[PDB]
Amino acid sequence: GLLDGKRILVSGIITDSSIAFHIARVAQEQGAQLVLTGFDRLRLIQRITDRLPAKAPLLELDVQNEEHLASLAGRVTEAIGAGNKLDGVVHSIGFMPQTGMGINPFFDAPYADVSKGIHISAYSYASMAKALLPIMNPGGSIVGMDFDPSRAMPAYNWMTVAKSALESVNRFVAREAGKYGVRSNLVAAGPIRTLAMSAIVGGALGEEAGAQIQLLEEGWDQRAPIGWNMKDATPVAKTVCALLSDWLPATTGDIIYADGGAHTQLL
Amino acid sequence: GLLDGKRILVSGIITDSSIAFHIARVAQEQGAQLVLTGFDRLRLIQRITDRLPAKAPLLELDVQNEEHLASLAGRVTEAIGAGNKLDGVVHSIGFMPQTGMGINPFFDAPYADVSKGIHISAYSYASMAKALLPIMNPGGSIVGMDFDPSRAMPAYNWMTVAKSALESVNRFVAREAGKYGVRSNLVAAGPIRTLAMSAIVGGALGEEAGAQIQLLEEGWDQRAPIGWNMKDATPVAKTVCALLSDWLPATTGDIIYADGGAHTQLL
Amino acid sequence: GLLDGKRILVSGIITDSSIAFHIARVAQEQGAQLVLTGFDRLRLIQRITDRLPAKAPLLELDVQNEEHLASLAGRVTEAIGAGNKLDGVVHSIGFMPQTGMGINPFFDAPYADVSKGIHISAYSYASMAKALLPIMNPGGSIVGMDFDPSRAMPAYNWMTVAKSALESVNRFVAREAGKYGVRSNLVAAGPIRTLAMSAIVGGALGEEAGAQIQLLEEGWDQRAPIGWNMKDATPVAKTVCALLSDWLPATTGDIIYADGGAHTQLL
Amino acid sequence: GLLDGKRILVSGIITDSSIAFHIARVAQEQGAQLVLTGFDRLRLIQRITDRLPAKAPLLELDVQNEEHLASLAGRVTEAIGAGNKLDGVVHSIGFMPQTGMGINPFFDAPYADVSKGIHISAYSYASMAKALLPIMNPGGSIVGMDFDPSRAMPAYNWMTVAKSALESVNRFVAREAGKYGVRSNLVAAGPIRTLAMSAIVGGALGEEAGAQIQLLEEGWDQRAPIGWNMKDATPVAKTVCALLSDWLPATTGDIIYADGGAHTQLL
């Protein structure tokens, strides 16, 4: 078991197609003992996580709530038992209001909306690190989820800016985590058909946005030398588990591309 | 004259060592007709700009003030005359509260402070573009100031995150500006001894911060194959003028490194 | 005149659609005095260059010929007059045998062929620098031509590898040239319809290769926020002249993208 | 066992401090069955590999020898048994003559020497892929060793150019290997005290070269958020094994940085 005996906190489950759901599943298959955090609809999240291979304690965490962050370490310790620390943390959280992502023109996003998205999608990575590093073991691992923002693209708009910020945050979190013997890295995944993503392809954010995602999905599988299957999150979940294991011991402040190789190819 | 007959808006002058002061000077030496914008201390800014080679109208612009942005194009047109448009825009604006930049630990920056800095240093680039593109000529140029944030560094902290966001914003501003025949690019400069920078070297942001900047300055000149003189902003001002001219007509969404070549060298 | 009084050596003219032909034309329009070098078909090259706005001495240079390189500086000094030095050098040279570029499978290129292409397309940039730096003025400029090789693409094959090598060579040439007060940079251009390029679109290197270039050309104009016109080399020639001028004085070991911004955009 | 039942070819062992020796050791500890290839001093290599945890067949391979490459697959099949294929290939080979690496000036490397180094260090990655892909299983993995060449550095000189070429080769090998269901990636390691490296620190390539490596080693550990121990190759060996396993299933044409995070940090 790749993660045997490791204690790992996984945020970001909201449905059974959430990337963090599959991260949580693969980690439990590999012997990890999990603690879960969920935002807002905790009864729904509980019913979703009941389908994980093993039962895992669920804690409430709204990343914009200072009280939630201040109590987090104590509530984690209460779930895993005093004297036990975390070996791994998974940040799988993201949000941008509709004004900053979609067919709404890039210039029309109010900063209040953009700021909320950068708060939840980028700053929260440092927030969670700060809350959880004091209860992490040496040799631990923090992993966040990324979507390659080094080039601009239709519709993603302000969320691409939030991703650019998150990659920069990750390189500073790595400097802090290094003082604990802890690594911090991001996994840049290719497009995955989550519920939200499926809703956008169906036009939830405007028809242009939906058409552009479909073109991006299609271009992705074409470019990827090993193909890309947007309906299979297993590859991304296994990559996260790789970074949570002891088998990338010299990688930190970095980005692993679980994208089928698409970013290495022009056409 | 490299910029003869061009009408160009320059923001960001606060003292005579501001990078935008030298941008403004070099552009006037090259035949440009300028309109200036200043924030807060407008009487001070006016007295500073009285020393530019030619007189230039000064307009008030706080980039966080929605009314200032809504009136900007009209006030620009009133200064340059109806029927005249802008050929160039210079964004030379930046700010991060002391909690996000310096010896204060990276985790201790409140998001309210970080958000203010990302607002003024990154989002304002899109804000100004939105305000000014409707009064820009085809073949125009928007230029912002950048400090290479692709690797983390001591003390810069949250401001590095703001720079990462600004580079991403620039690639989307380029998509909008392209509809106008307008380019958008950033100039990534090496360290320059502005008043603020000199204050930090003297310890305004804590002694550790001051020592780290000095080490970064020293490493910069060493790495740069043509040297780097932190007391000479002329090189950065000439680079901005290059991008405002017609001599980089196929460069947009991009970053020009006016850093002595330091970013191309390891040691 | 952007280049008034500057003495500049331009290699790489073979027909009137060569990128170096337009570089040479724009530089002469901007007051530069040129010395030309040509390979192999010198009578043809002479007849082509007779159409430049001004007459320019033509020197023979095969970059694989050690005797040609050993005599180059002396022959340049004889053309521009003793006591005069060069202010600028343009490397616009490239070649890969058909086995390393096209529909021939990537694995089937013999190393002898690949090595010849890397010799002429990458190593020759250091070769020319070595020959010409001792007769270059402080404040001089060396410019090479590049095609963005940071991602793989169909058909370009071994020539992409040669471009990757040339970018690396450029960063070391900059270290040598810095000792002379001389900059060294590359211009990464978008696809241009040279004779060779047109021949490939017509199938000279196999039908698959021809179809892939056409798709790459089409994707380029789409991605470029300001468009890309593959039949107009003026934009690339003006960019080279920008780097030969005094208006990028702090850029070296670097790459300027004269590609319409296409490399900054995903779709 | 991370690599249980996997059959893996490992090149590049020459002493017990070779990176490939530790790759071979860690892979055998993780249940892999190995086939080894060695160059030139095969009796020495055999005596070195006698100390691996398990015995492994040794095959002769000079990567510049066309007959060696033409027979390789057949000799591999004879060692692992007909009907068995390879699951993994490790390229751990590199060489640059003293004229292209060290205190000898960058311009003084003859192309014959540079070409030999690019042949053995870069082209050989495609050569081995071509020889071995027809005897690789779907889901297989090819891994090469890299040293981050994206910025220039003292002394490494032409070998940095060879690394730049190898990264480009890797992105095309990935396109070929994808047709087989096979991944291809590089591991960019921090400096490791091999015999050759120790000899250079002791002055084998000139005193300046030796002093610059020591400064690069020291800067590396400083920059690395988790530290860098140049005398421990275990971290790099475990990273290679990660890529040979099934736990990075969506990564290809890519580069994993096993460098302590040093490349993500400026100072």
Ligand SMILES: NC(=O)c1ccc[n+]([C@@H]2O[C@H](COP(=O)([O-])OP(=O)(O)OC[C@H]3O[C@@H](n4cnc5c(N)ncnc54)[C@H](O)[C@@H]3O)[C@@H](O)[C@H]2O)c1
């Ligand atoms: N689907 C993709 O294509 C893709 C690709 C790359 C990266 N990612 C990244 O994966 C991550 C997870 O998204 P997802 O795709 O799986 O979708 P998702 O919708 O399933 O999950 C997002 C989660 O963010 C959480 N969240 C939102 N606001 C929160 C808040 N204040 N506090 C705490 N949690 C909050 C949500 O509750 C939700 O669980 C994102 O960071 C996303 O950007 C997704």
Ligand SMILES: NC(=O)c1ccc[n+]([C@@H]2O[C@H](COP(=O)([O-])OP(=O)(O)OC[C@H]3O[C@@H](n4cnc5c(N)ncnc54)[C@H](O)[C@@H]3O)[C@@H](O)[C@H]2O)c1
């Ligand atoms: N000095 C350097 O080393 C260096 C290097 C690279 C980039 N830059 C960049 O150059 C730019 C200018 O800074 P500077 O160095 O010249 O220093 P500066 O202090 O002189 O100028 C900064 C200006 O930002 C303006 N500003 C702050 N808040 C503003 C607001 N709400 N609204 C409008 N304007 C506001 C200030 O008034 C000031 O004029 C920055 O963007 C900075 O990050 C500086």
Ligand SMILES: NC(=O)c1ccc[n+]([C@@H]2O[C@H](COP(=O)([O-])OP(=O)(O)OC[C@H]3O[C@@H](n4cnc5c(N)ncnc54)[C@H](O)[C@@H]3O)[C@@H](O)[C@H]2O)c1
């Ligand atoms: N057309 C494009 O799309 C494009 C894009 C980017 C970069 N470039 C680059 O521009 C440069 C010039 O090519 P081009 O497009 O203009 O085509 P070209 O065919 O017109 O010019 C190439 C020149 O290389 C010279 N050359 C070949 N072997 C030589 C040798 N041994 N010694 C000296 N000179 C030799 C040729 O004589 C010729 O003048 C190339 O380096 C090329 O890779 C071209």
Ligand SMILES: NC(=O)c1ccc[n+]([C@@H]2O[C@H](COP(=O)([O-])OP(=O)(O)OC[C@H]3O[C@@H](n4cnc5c(N)ncnc54)[C@H](O)[C@@H]3O)[C@@H](O)[C@H]2O)c1
């Ligand atoms: N030591 C480091 O710091 C470091 C860092 C990053 C990458 N690498 C890379 O690791 C790899 C291995 O080198 P090393 O450090 O372990 O040193 P090494 O000297 O131990 O190994 C190099 C091997 O290359 C082989 N080789 C040379 N010519 C060959 C040829 N014609 N045919 C077949 N094999 C040939 C040698 O026999 C030797 O086994 C290199 O590719 C190297 O560039 C090393």
Ligand SMILES: Cc1c(S(=O)(=O)Nc2cccc(CN)c2)sc2ccc(Cl)cc12
């Ligand atoms: C959403 C999205 C992604 S994402 O899933 O990677 N990021 C993300 C952002 C916000 C909220 C969430 C969680 N529901 C995730 S890529 C891409 C490309 C084009 C478009 Cl229009 C959208 C997207």
Ligand SMILES: Cc1c(S(=O)(=O)Nc2cccc(CN)c2)sc2ccc(Cl)cc12
């Ligand atoms: C300030 C700063 C720069 S900066 O001048 O480029 N950016 C900037 C940020 C904020 C406000 C301003 C305008 N006064 C400018 S680099 C660098 C490296 C280390 C440190 Cl501690 C600081 C800096």
Ligand SMILES: Cc1c(S(=O)(=O)Nc2cccc(CN)c2)sc2ccc(Cl)cc12
């Ligand atoms: C040729 C070529 C270029 S190039 O013009 O940039 N480079 C080059 C290479 C070799 C010889 C020359 C000079 N005739 C130029 S890009 C691209 C993309 C796909 C394909 Cl199939 C080809 C090309």
Ligand SMILES: Cc1c(S(=O)(=O)Nc2cccc(CN)c2)sc2ccc(Cl)cc12
């Ligand atoms: C050698 C070397 C490396 S290397 O080990 O990564 N590459 C390599 C090259 C050639 C032959 C081998 C195998 N003996 C390995 S980095 C670095 C930095 C500075 C200097 Cl002077 C040297 C080096």
